[PDB]
Write a protein that binds this ligand. Structure first.
Ligand SMILES: [Mg+2]
Lengths: 33, 34, 32, 31
């Protein structure tokens, strides 16, 4: 179950990294206009 | 004890996810993205 | 726009705080 | 001035976030 949890941590981190990339993409468009 | 500590890590990354979802939605609304 | 951006900033404080906690917890688990 | 200042603040916090994401990635592999 440790391996299961490590996998879950990794999946969550990937999800969160995408969302940070989204914040970066969107904030540049507020800045832009 | 690795299990309890990793469970706590997962819960906190879920809070992170919740917050980031809120921020992303708020910025999409600002730029008119839907 | 300013008001919304201010809330974005404030919520990102929470994101980083939570992440700091996670890093700290892993460090004590691995013995760093 | 204020929008630009707030965008800069957002980008600084994201920078800190990216580093922390990297650290979580490094640390969890060591478990
Ligand atoms: Mg929170």
């Amino acid at each position: 179950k440790v391996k299961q949890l490590v996998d879950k941590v990794e999946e969550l981190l990937s999800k969160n990294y995408h969302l940070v990339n989204e914040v970066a993409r969107l904030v540049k468009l507020v800045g832009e206009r | 004890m690795k299990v309890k500590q990793l469970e706590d890590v997962v819960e906190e990354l879920l809070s992170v996810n919740y917050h980031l979802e809120n921020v992303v939605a708020r910025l999409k609304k600002l730029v008119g993205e839907r």
